[PDB]
Amino acid sequence: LSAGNYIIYNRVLSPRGEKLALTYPGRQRTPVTVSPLDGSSEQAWILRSYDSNSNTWTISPVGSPNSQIGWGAGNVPVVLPPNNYVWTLTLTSGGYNIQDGKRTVSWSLNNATAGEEVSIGADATFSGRWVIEKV
Amino acid sequence: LSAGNYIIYNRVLSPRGEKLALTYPGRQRTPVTVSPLDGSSEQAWILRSYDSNSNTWTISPVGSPNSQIGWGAGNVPVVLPPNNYVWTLTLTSGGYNIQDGKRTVSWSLNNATAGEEVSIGADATFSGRWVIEKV
Ligand SMILES: [Cl-]
């Protein structure tokens, strides 16, 4: 895994079979959601290596490339002005487990539906795992 | 849902993000598996309505169209010579729940990996739900 632009989508598809991709809501301090994979810029993220030895990274929307995803009140990711907000990206045999820098919580989807806000908390079979693809 | 040819794939993707489609192994009395969606004829199934009131169907591989999927020993589906083997196809708000005619068991995947045999038993969040798409 290396720096560049990526899509990030859940292992669990929508009820209609759509890949549910991390989607920038177009402004800061607004819960980041998933939506059907569609090639829009809101679904492209810049990963920058923070500590390679820690597998930690910053994640920035291409639309606002200096901004970073942080841990929002309500336990949802939100985009913010930069301040070393990082996530651990661990490749497991079930896909990526996206955790905070201290590896105490995980991103998941509760229902895996279009428009759903990403949850930060307990790890979850299947919906706690993600796919990260270049470009 | 109507008679015709379909792909049938899990709501849960492989760890690499591949849609896992029901795949005929090319002979009878051999556990039916899932594999990455690839347009092969082994992934095309003929659905015929058995009883509309009870929502039951026969499922036959296009490769051996008179044959039917039945409930195999070891609780895995297998293909067999026809003898009214049916499955209930219920569209829930989380996708299709594929059960036996009596609605006591469900098809799911334990790990949702390429090559995995389909399990017949407990309903399972996410991996007990399916997507059924024409042709
Ligand atoms: Cl058998």
PDB file of C-alpha atoms and ligand atoms in Angstrom:
ATOM      1  CA  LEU A   1       0.000   0.000   0.000  1.00  0.00           C
ATOM      2  CA  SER A   2       1.394   3.429  -1.042  1.00  0.00           C
ATOM      3  CA  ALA A   3       0.560   7.203  -1.399  1.00  0.00           C
ATOM      4  CA  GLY A   4      -1.844   8.369  -4.165  1.00  0.00           C
ATOM      5  CA  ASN A   5      -5.552   8.508  -4.862  1.00  0.00           C
ATOM      6  CA  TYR A   6      -7.971   5.775  -3.927  1.00  0.00           C
ATOM      7  CA  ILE A   7     -11.501   4.565  -3.661  1.00  0.00           C
ATOM      8  CA  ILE A   8     -12.435   2.885  -0.427  1.00  0.00           C
ATOM      9  CA  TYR A   9     -15.501   0.652  -0.384  1.00  0.00           C
ATOM     10  CA  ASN A  10     -17.194  -1.747   2.001  1.00  0.00           C
ATOM     11  CA  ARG A  11     -17.054  -5.549   1.658  1.00  0.00           C
ATOM     12  CA  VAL A  12     -20.858  -5.572   2.070  1.00  0.00           C
ATOM     13  CA  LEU A  13     -22.820  -4.492  -0.964  1.00  0.00           C
ATOM     14  CA  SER A  14     -26.099  -2.584  -0.922  1.00  0.00           C
ATOM     15  CA  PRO A  15     -29.284  -4.674  -0.987  1.00  0.00           C
ATOM     16  CA  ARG A  16     -29.246  -4.029  -4.774  1.00  0.00           C
ATOM     17  CA  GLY A  17     -25.628  -5.287  -5.221  1.00  0.00           C
ATOM     18  CA  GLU A  18     -23.887  -1.904  -5.377  1.00  0.00           C
ATOM     19  CA  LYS A  19     -20.407  -1.351  -4.052  1.00  0.00           C
ATOM     20  CA  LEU A  20     -20.711   1.206  -1.296  1.00  0.00           C
ATOM     21  CA  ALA A  21     -17.878   3.736  -1.552  1.00  0.00           C
ATOM     22  CA  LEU A  22     -16.670   6.327   0.922  1.00  0.00           C
ATOM     23  CA  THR A  23     -18.135   9.613  -0.188  1.00  0.00           C
ATOM     24  CA  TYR A  24     -17.097  13.151   0.702  1.00  0.00           C
ATOM     25  CA  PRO A  25     -20.170  15.177   1.520  1.00  0.00           C
ATOM     26  CA  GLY A  26     -18.688  18.283  -0.056  1.00  0.00           C
ATOM     27  CA  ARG A  27     -17.903  20.127   3.172  1.00  0.00           C
ATOM     28  CA  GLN A  28     -16.299  19.912   6.546  1.00  0.00           C
ATOM     29  CA  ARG A  29     -17.663  18.657   9.864  1.00  0.00           C
ATOM     30  CA  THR A  30     -20.343  16.711   8.048  1.00  0.00           C
ATOM     31  CA  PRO A  31     -20.634  12.925   8.514  1.00  0.00           C
ATOM     32  CA  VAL A  32     -18.921  10.982   5.793  1.00  0.00           C
ATOM     33  CA  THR A  33     -21.297   8.488   4.130  1.00  0.00           C
ATOM     34  CA  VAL A  34     -21.135   5.655   1.630  1.00  0.00           C
ATOM     35  CA  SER A  35     -22.837   5.691  -1.725  1.00  0.00           C
ATOM     36  CA  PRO A  36     -22.890   3.545  -4.833  1.00  0.00           C
ATOM     37  CA  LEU A  37     -19.583   3.467  -6.632  1.00  0.00           C
ATOM     38  CA  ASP A  38     -19.892   5.930  -9.538  1.00  0.00           C
ATOM     39  CA  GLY A  39     -16.501   7.445 -10.467  1.00  0.00           C
ATOM     40  CA  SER A  40     -17.362  10.876  -8.933  1.00  0.00           C
ATOM     41  CA  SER A  41     -14.571  12.984  -7.397  1.00  0.00           C
ATOM     42  CA  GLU A  42     -16.339  12.821  -4.015  1.00  0.00           C
ATOM     43  CA  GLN A  43     -15.320   9.137  -3.935  1.00  0.00           C
ATOM     44  CA  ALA A  44     -11.602   9.790  -4.557  1.00  0.00           C
ATOM     45  CA  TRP A  45      -9.346  10.100  -1.554  1.00  0.00           C
ATOM     46  CA  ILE A  46      -5.694  11.022  -1.143  1.00  0.00           C
ATOM     47  CA  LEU A  47      -3.802   8.695   1.130  1.00  0.00           C
ATOM     48  CA  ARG A  48      -0.580  10.094   2.592  1.00  0.00           C
ATOM     49  CA  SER A  49       1.699   7.941   4.686  1.00  0.00           C
ATOM     50  CA  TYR A  50       2.053   9.258   8.190  1.00  0.00           C
ATOM     51  CA  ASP A  51       4.024   6.584   9.932  1.00  0.00           C
ATOM     52  CA  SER A  52       4.788   3.678   7.492  1.00  0.00           C
ATOM     53  CA  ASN A  53       6.110   1.685  10.449  1.00  0.00           C
ATOM     54  CA  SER A  54       2.721   2.138  12.061  1.00  0.00           C
ATOM     55  CA  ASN A  55       0.570   1.640   9.029  1.00  0.00           C
ATOM     56  CA  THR A  56      -0.999   5.041   9.762  1.00  0.00           C
ATOM     57  CA  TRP A  57      -2.230   7.388   7.097  1.00  0.00           C
ATOM     58  CA  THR A  58      -4.037  10.625   6.552  1.00  0.00           C
ATOM     59  CA  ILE A  59      -7.027  10.549   4.285  1.00  0.00           C
ATOM     60  CA  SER A  60      -8.053  13.664   2.356  1.00  0.00           C
ATOM     61  CA  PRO A  61     -10.811  14.215  -0.182  1.00  0.00           C
ATOM     62  CA  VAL A  62      -9.469  15.229  -3.636  1.00  0.00           C
ATOM     63  CA  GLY A  63     -11.980  18.062  -3.553  1.00  0.00           C
ATOM     64  CA  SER A  64     -10.286  19.611  -0.520  1.00  0.00           C
ATOM     65  CA  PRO A  65      -6.874  17.977  -0.514  1.00  0.00           C
ATOM     66  CA  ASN A  66      -5.431  19.653   2.579  1.00  0.00           C
ATOM     67  CA  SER A  67      -8.291  18.529   4.735  1.00  0.00           C
ATOM     68  CA  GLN A  68      -8.339  15.314   6.719  1.00  0.00           C
ATOM     69  CA  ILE A  69     -10.839  12.787   7.963  1.00  0.00           C
ATOM     70  CA  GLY A  70     -11.035  12.879  11.752  1.00  0.00           C
ATOM     71  CA  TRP A  71     -13.125  11.143  14.416  1.00  0.00           C
ATOM     72  CA  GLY A  72     -16.323  13.114  14.719  1.00  0.00           C
ATOM     73  CA  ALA A  73     -18.694  13.511  17.628  1.00  0.00           C
ATOM     74  CA  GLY A  74     -21.411  10.946  17.204  1.00  0.00           C
ATOM     75  CA  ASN A  75     -18.695   8.460  16.218  1.00  0.00           C
ATOM     76  CA  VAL A  76     -18.737   9.163  12.518  1.00  0.00           C
ATOM     77  CA  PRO A  77     -15.919  10.303  10.366  1.00  0.00           C
ATOM     78  CA  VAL A  78     -15.858  13.973   9.447  1.00  0.00           C
ATOM     79  CA  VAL A  79     -13.557  16.150   7.352  1.00  0.00           C
ATOM     80  CA  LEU A  80     -11.575  18.899   9.151  1.00  0.00           C
ATOM     81  CA  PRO A  81      -8.678  21.265   8.783  1.00  0.00           C
ATOM     82  CA  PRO A  82      -5.451  19.329   9.016  1.00  0.00           C
ATOM     83  CA  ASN A  83      -4.027  18.449  12.372  1.00  0.00           C
ATOM     84  CA  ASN A  84      -2.391  15.040  11.969  1.00  0.00           C
ATOM     85  CA  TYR A  85      -5.665  13.103  12.029  1.00  0.00           C
ATOM     86  CA  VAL A  86      -4.635   9.544  11.169  1.00  0.00           C
ATOM     87  CA  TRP A  87      -6.102   6.107  10.623  1.00  0.00           C
ATOM     88  CA  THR A  88      -4.460   2.727  10.825  1.00  0.00           C
ATOM     89  CA  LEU A  89      -5.005   0.694   7.640  1.00  0.00           C
ATOM     90  CA  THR A  90      -4.403  -2.926   8.402  1.00  0.00           C
ATOM     91  CA  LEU A  91      -4.764  -5.522   5.668  1.00  0.00           C
ATOM     92  CA  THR A  92      -6.277  -8.644   7.274  1.00  0.00           C
ATOM     93  CA  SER A  93      -7.221 -11.842   5.506  1.00  0.00           C
ATOM     94  CA  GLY A  94     -10.764 -10.454   5.433  1.00  0.00           C
ATOM     95  CA  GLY A  95      -9.790  -7.063   3.930  1.00  0.00           C
ATOM     96  CA  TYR A  96      -8.830  -3.731   5.413  1.00  0.00           C
ATOM     97  CA  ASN A  97      -9.627  -2.981   9.027  1.00  0.00           C
ATOM     98  CA  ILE A  98      -9.715   0.833   9.254  1.00  0.00           C
ATOM     99  CA  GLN A  99      -8.988   1.873  12.827  1.00  0.00           C
ATOM    100  CA  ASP A 100      -7.926   4.923  14.756  1.00  0.00           C
ATOM    101  CA  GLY A 101      -4.207   5.452  15.324  1.00  0.00           C
ATOM    102  CA  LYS A 102      -4.473   3.651  18.701  1.00  0.00           C
ATOM    103  CA  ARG A 103      -6.384   0.692  17.207  1.00  0.00           C
ATOM    104  CA  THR A 104      -9.242   0.816  19.730  1.00  0.00           C
ATOM    105  CA  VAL A 105     -12.125   1.373  17.212  1.00  0.00           C
ATOM    106  CA  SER A 106     -13.048   0.401  13.638  1.00  0.00           C
ATOM    107  CA  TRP A 107     -15.059   1.817  10.752  1.00  0.00           C
ATOM    108  CA  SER A 108     -18.129  -0.146   9.795  1.00  0.00           C
ATOM    109  CA  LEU A 109     -21.599   0.108   8.346  1.00  0.00           C
ATOM    110  CA  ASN A 110     -24.584  -0.962  10.368  1.00  0.00           C
ATOM    111  CA  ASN A 111     -26.905  -1.879   7.488  1.00  0.00           C
ATOM    112  CA  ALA A 112     -24.785  -1.273   4.420  1.00  0.00           C
ATOM    113  CA  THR A 113     -27.240   0.924   2.588  1.00  0.00           C
ATOM    114  CA  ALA A 114     -26.758   3.804   0.174  1.00  0.00           C
ATOM    115  CA  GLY A 115     -26.403   7.108   2.002  1.00  0.00           C
ATOM    116  CA  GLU A 116     -25.398   5.436   5.279  1.00  0.00           C
ATOM    117  CA  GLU A 117     -23.077   7.293   7.640  1.00  0.00           C
ATOM    118  CA  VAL A 118     -19.932   5.374   8.474  1.00  0.00           C
ATOM    119  CA  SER A 119     -19.799   4.218  12.137  1.00  0.00           C
ATOM    120  CA  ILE A 120     -16.712   4.344  14.301  1.00  0.00           C
ATOM    121  CA  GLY A 121     -16.820   1.737  17.055  1.00  0.00           C
ATOM    122  CA  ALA A 122     -16.954  -2.048  17.394  1.00  0.00           C
ATOM    123  CA  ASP A 123     -15.428  -4.148  14.694  1.00  0.00           C
ATOM    124  CA  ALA A 124     -18.021  -6.105  12.690  1.00  0.00           C
ATOM    125  CA  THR A 125     -17.885  -9.209  10.673  1.00  0.00           C
ATOM    126  CA  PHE A 126     -18.028  -8.255   7.033  1.00  0.00           C
ATOM    127  CA  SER A 127     -19.169  -4.641   7.299  1.00  0.00           C
ATOM    128  CA  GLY A 128     -16.081  -3.811   9.325  1.00  0.00           C
ATOM    129  CA  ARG A 129     -13.904  -4.717   6.353  1.00  0.00           C
ATOM    130  CA  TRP A 130     -12.983  -2.531   3.395  1.00  0.00           C
ATOM    131  CA  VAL A 131     -11.475  -2.611  -0.053  1.00  0.00           C
ATOM    132  CA  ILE A 132      -9.009   0.048  -1.128  1.00  0.00           C
ATOM    133  CA  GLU A 133      -8.241   0.412  -4.798  1.00  0.00           C
ATOM    134  CA  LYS A 134      -5.894   2.746  -6.525  1.00  0.00           C
ATOM    135  CA  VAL A 135      -7.322   5.578  -8.634  1.00  0.00           C
TER     136      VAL A 135
ATOM    137  CA  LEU B   1     -38.946 -11.915 -10.367  1.00  0.00           C
ATOM    138  CA  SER B   2     -39.841 -14.095 -13.336  1.00  0.00           C
ATOM    139  CA  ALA B   3     -38.676 -17.244 -15.141  1.00  0.00           C
ATOM    140  CA  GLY B   4     -35.460 -16.946 -17.190  1.00  0.00           C
ATOM    141  CA  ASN B   5     -31.709 -16.922 -16.712  1.00  0.00           C
ATOM    142  CA  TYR B   6     -29.902 -15.346 -13.838  1.00  0.00           C
ATOM    143  CA  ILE B   7     -26.708 -14.789 -11.916  1.00  0.00           C
ATOM    144  CA  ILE B   8     -26.994 -15.160  -8.189  1.00  0.00           C
ATOM    145  CA  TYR B   9     -24.346 -13.522  -6.051  1.00  0.00           C
ATOM    146  CA  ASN B  10     -23.689 -12.845  -2.376  1.00  0.00           C
ATOM    147  CA  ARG B  11     -24.111  -9.483  -0.677  1.00  0.00           C
ATOM    148  CA  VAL B  12     -20.622  -9.990   0.787  1.00  0.00           C
ATOM    149  CA  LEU B  13     -17.699  -9.494  -1.522  1.00  0.00           C
ATOM    150  CA  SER B  14     -14.465 -11.426  -1.439  1.00  0.00           C
ATOM    151  CA  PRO B  15     -11.645  -9.820   0.575  1.00  0.00           C
ATOM    152  CA  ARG B  16     -10.451  -8.366  -2.795  1.00  0.00           C
ATOM    153  CA  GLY B  17     -13.818  -6.829  -3.604  1.00  0.00           C
ATOM    154  CA  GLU B  18     -15.087  -9.446  -6.043  1.00  0.00           C
ATOM    155  CA  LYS B  19     -18.733 -10.302  -6.393  1.00  0.00           C
ATOM    156  CA  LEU B  20     -19.074 -13.939  -5.424  1.00  0.00           C
ATOM    157  CA  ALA B  21     -21.424 -15.728  -7.798  1.00  0.00           C
ATOM    158  CA  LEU B  22     -23.065 -19.127  -7.519  1.00  0.00           C
ATOM    159  CA  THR B  23     -21.036 -21.419  -9.678  1.00  0.00           C
ATOM    160  CA  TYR B  24     -21.941 -24.831 -11.092  1.00  0.00           C
ATOM    161  CA  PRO B  25     -18.999 -27.194 -10.563  1.00  0.00           C
ATOM    162  CA  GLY B  26     -19.588 -29.016 -13.870  1.00  0.00           C
ATOM    163  CA  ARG B  27     -20.981 -32.227 -12.460  1.00  0.00           C
ATOM    164  CA  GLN B  28     -23.703 -33.599 -10.293  1.00  0.00           C
ATOM    165  CA  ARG B  29     -23.572 -34.365  -6.584  1.00  0.00           C
ATOM    166  CA  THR B  30     -20.678 -31.953  -6.120  1.00  0.00           C
ATOM    167  CA  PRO B  31     -20.950 -28.998  -3.685  1.00  0.00           C
ATOM    168  CA  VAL B  32     -21.966 -25.780  -5.350  1.00  0.00           C
ATOM    169  CA  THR B  33     -19.487 -22.992  -4.652  1.00  0.00           C
ATOM    170  CA  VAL B  34     -19.126 -19.293  -5.250  1.00  0.00           C
ATOM    171  CA  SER B  35     -16.476 -17.686  -7.369  1.00  0.00           C
ATOM    172  CA  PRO B  36     -15.654 -14.258  -8.755  1.00  0.00           C
ATOM    173  CA  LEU B  37     -18.257 -12.969 -11.176  1.00  0.00           C
ATOM    174  CA  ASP B  38     -16.819 -13.506 -14.665  1.00  0.00           C
ATOM    175  CA  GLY B  39     -19.575 -14.051 -17.249  1.00  0.00           C
ATOM    176  CA  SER B  40     -18.903 -17.831 -17.479  1.00  0.00           C
ATOM    177  CA  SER B  41     -21.834 -20.168 -18.242  1.00  0.00           C
ATOM    178  CA  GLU B  42     -21.220 -21.977 -14.949  1.00  0.00           C
ATOM    179  CA  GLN B  43     -22.554 -18.819 -13.265  1.00  0.00           C
ATOM    180  CA  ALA B  44     -25.838 -18.708 -15.254  1.00  0.00           C
ATOM    181  CA  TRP B  45     -28.900 -20.359 -13.722  1.00  0.00           C
ATOM    182  CA  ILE B  46     -32.366 -21.060 -15.038  1.00  0.00           C
ATOM    183  CA  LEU B  47     -35.111 -20.135 -12.579  1.00  0.00           C
ATOM    184  CA  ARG B  48     -38.471 -21.798 -13.144  1.00  0.00           C
ATOM    185  CA  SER B  49     -41.491 -20.983 -11.005  1.00  0.00           C
ATOM    186  CA  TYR B  50     -42.688 -24.026  -9.137  1.00  0.00           C
ATOM    187  CA  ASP B  51     -45.435 -22.588  -6.977  1.00  0.00           C
ATOM    188  CA  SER B  52     -46.177 -18.877  -7.135  1.00  0.00           C
ATOM    189  CA  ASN B  53     -48.274 -18.763  -3.919  1.00  0.00           C
ATOM    190  CA  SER B  54     -45.460 -20.235  -1.888  1.00  0.00           C
ATOM    191  CA  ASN B  55     -42.651 -18.431  -3.776  1.00  0.00           C
ATOM    192  CA  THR B  56     -40.785 -21.539  -4.660  1.00  0.00           C
ATOM    193  CA  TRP B  57     -38.555 -22.140  -7.646  1.00  0.00           C
ATOM    194  CA  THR B  58     -36.362 -24.730  -9.275  1.00  0.00           C
ATOM    195  CA  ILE B  59     -32.831 -23.673 -10.070  1.00  0.00           C
ATOM    196  CA  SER B  60     -30.981 -25.381 -12.918  1.00  0.00           C
ATOM    197  CA  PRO B  61     -27.490 -24.707 -14.360  1.00  0.00           C
ATOM    198  CA  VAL B  62     -27.605 -23.576 -18.027  1.00  0.00           C
ATOM    199  CA  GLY B  63     -24.956 -26.223 -18.590  1.00  0.00           C
ATOM    200  CA  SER B  64     -27.395 -29.052 -17.605  1.00  0.00           C
ATOM    201  CA  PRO B  65     -30.773 -27.369 -17.813  1.00  0.00           C
ATOM    202  CA  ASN B  66     -32.942 -30.310 -16.737  1.00  0.00           C
ATOM    203  CA  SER B  67     -30.925 -30.753 -13.553  1.00  0.00           C
ATOM    204  CA  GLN B  68     -31.774 -29.112 -10.252  1.00  0.00           C
ATOM    205  CA  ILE B  69     -30.062 -27.833  -7.175  1.00  0.00           C
ATOM    206  CA  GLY B  70     -31.011 -29.874  -4.110  1.00  0.00           C
ATOM    207  CA  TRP B  71     -30.051 -29.941  -0.414  1.00  0.00           C
ATOM    208  CA  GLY B  72     -26.930 -32.053  -0.201  1.00  0.00           C
ATOM    209  CA  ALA B  73     -25.604 -34.090   2.658  1.00  0.00           C
ATOM    210  CA  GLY B  74     -23.223 -31.927   4.567  1.00  0.00           C
ATOM    211  CA  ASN B  75     -25.700 -29.065   4.138  1.00  0.00           C
ATOM    212  CA  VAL B  76     -24.308 -27.746   0.901  1.00  0.00           C
ATOM    213  CA  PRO B  77     -26.226 -27.416  -2.339  1.00  0.00           C
ATOM    214  CA  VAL B  78     -25.641 -30.001  -5.009  1.00  0.00           C
ATOM    215  CA  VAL B  79     -26.969 -30.519  -8.540  1.00  0.00           C
ATOM    216  CA  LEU B  80     -29.075 -33.622  -9.178  1.00  0.00           C
ATOM    217  CA  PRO B  81     -31.389 -35.254 -11.616  1.00  0.00           C
ATOM    218  CA  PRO B  82     -34.736 -33.533 -11.433  1.00  0.00           C
ATOM    219  CA  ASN B  83     -37.233 -34.474  -8.763  1.00  0.00           C
ATOM    220  CA  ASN B  84     -39.017 -31.298  -7.732  1.00  0.00           C
ATOM    221  CA  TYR B  85     -36.160 -29.857  -5.677  1.00  0.00           C
ATOM    222  CA  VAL B  86     -37.264 -26.325  -4.832  1.00  0.00           C
ATOM    223  CA  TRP B  87     -36.080 -23.210  -3.009  1.00  0.00           C
ATOM    224  CA  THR B  88     -38.036 -20.303  -1.637  1.00  0.00           C
ATOM    225  CA  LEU B  89     -36.795 -16.920  -2.948  1.00  0.00           C
ATOM    226  CA  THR B  90     -37.917 -14.159  -0.652  1.00  0.00           C
ATOM    227  CA  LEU B  91     -36.994 -10.563  -1.378  1.00  0.00           C
ATOM    228  CA  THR B  92     -36.356  -8.879   1.998  1.00  0.00           C
ATOM    229  CA  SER B  93     -35.260  -5.317   2.495  1.00  0.00           C
ATOM    230  CA  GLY B  94     -31.743  -6.725   2.817  1.00  0.00           C
ATOM    231  CA  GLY B  95     -31.842  -8.714  -0.425  1.00  0.00           C
ATOM    232  CA  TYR B  96     -32.866 -12.277  -1.246  1.00  0.00           C
ATOM    233  CA  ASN B  97     -33.160 -14.874   1.483  1.00  0.00           C
ATOM    234  CA  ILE B  98     -32.801 -18.236  -0.278  1.00  0.00           C
ATOM    235  CA  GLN B  99     -34.433 -20.945   1.777  1.00  0.00           C
ATOM    236  CA  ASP B 100     -35.687 -24.459   1.414  1.00  0.00           C
ATOM    237  CA  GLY B 101     -39.336 -24.999   0.433  1.00  0.00           C
ATOM    238  CA  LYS B 102     -40.312 -25.201   4.126  1.00  0.00           C
ATOM    239  CA  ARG B 103     -38.404 -22.020   5.105  1.00  0.00           C
ATOM    240  CA  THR B 104     -36.369 -23.565   7.914  1.00  0.00           C
ATOM    241  CA  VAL B 105     -32.849 -22.969   6.542  1.00  0.00           C
ATOM    242  CA  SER B 106     -30.986 -20.375   4.466  1.00  0.00           C
ATOM    243  CA  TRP B 107     -28.042 -20.307   2.035  1.00  0.00           C
ATOM    244  CA  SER B 108     -25.076 -18.366   3.296  1.00  0.00           C
ATOM    245  CA  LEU B 109     -21.297 -18.094   3.125  1.00  0.00           C
ATOM    246  CA  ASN B 110     -19.206 -18.493   6.246  1.00  0.00           C
ATOM    247  CA  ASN B 111     -16.206 -16.451   5.116  1.00  0.00           C
ATOM    248  CA  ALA B 112     -17.238 -15.162   1.699  1.00  0.00           C
ATOM    249  CA  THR B 113     -14.126 -16.270  -0.154  1.00  0.00           C
ATOM    250  CA  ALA B 114     -13.555 -17.408  -3.703  1.00  0.00           C
ATOM    251  CA  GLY B 115     -14.091 -21.148  -4.081  1.00  0.00           C
ATOM    252  CA  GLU B 116     -16.199 -21.362  -0.915  1.00  0.00           C
ATOM    253  CA  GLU B 117     -18.954 -23.964  -0.701  1.00  0.00           C
ATOM    254  CA  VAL B 118     -22.365 -22.514  -0.032  1.00  0.00           C
ATOM    255  CA  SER B 119     -23.768 -23.452   3.418  1.00  0.00           C
ATOM    256  CA  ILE B 120     -27.323 -24.427   4.136  1.00  0.00           C
ATOM    257  CA  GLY B 121     -28.373 -23.585   7.693  1.00  0.00           C
ATOM    258  CA  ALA B 122     -28.616 -20.526   9.901  1.00  0.00           C
ATOM    259  CA  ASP B 123     -29.579 -17.279   8.397  1.00  0.00           C
ATOM    260  CA  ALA B 124     -26.584 -14.908   8.611  1.00  0.00           C
ATOM    261  CA  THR B 125     -26.419 -11.204   8.606  1.00  0.00           C
ATOM    262  CA  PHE B 126     -25.097 -10.026   5.278  1.00  0.00           C
ATOM    263  CA  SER B 127     -23.757 -13.355   3.929  1.00  0.00           C
ATOM    264  CA  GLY B 128     -27.244 -14.874   4.165  1.00  0.00           C
ATOM    265  CA  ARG B 129     -28.458 -12.328   1.593  1.00  0.00           C
ATOM    266  CA  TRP B 130     -28.188 -12.538  -2.169  1.00  0.00           C
ATOM    267  CA  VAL B 131     -28.520 -10.516  -5.359  1.00  0.00           C
ATOM    268  CA  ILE B 132     -30.309 -12.041  -8.345  1.00  0.00           C
ATOM    269  CA  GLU B 133     -29.838 -10.334 -11.682  1.00  0.00           C
ATOM    270  CA  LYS B 134     -31.196 -11.205 -15.064  1.00  0.00           C
ATOM    271  CA  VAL B 135     -29.071 -12.987 -17.666  1.00  0.00           C
TER     272      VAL B 135
HETATM  273 CL    CL C   1     -24.255 -35.851  -2.901  1.00  0.00          CL
END
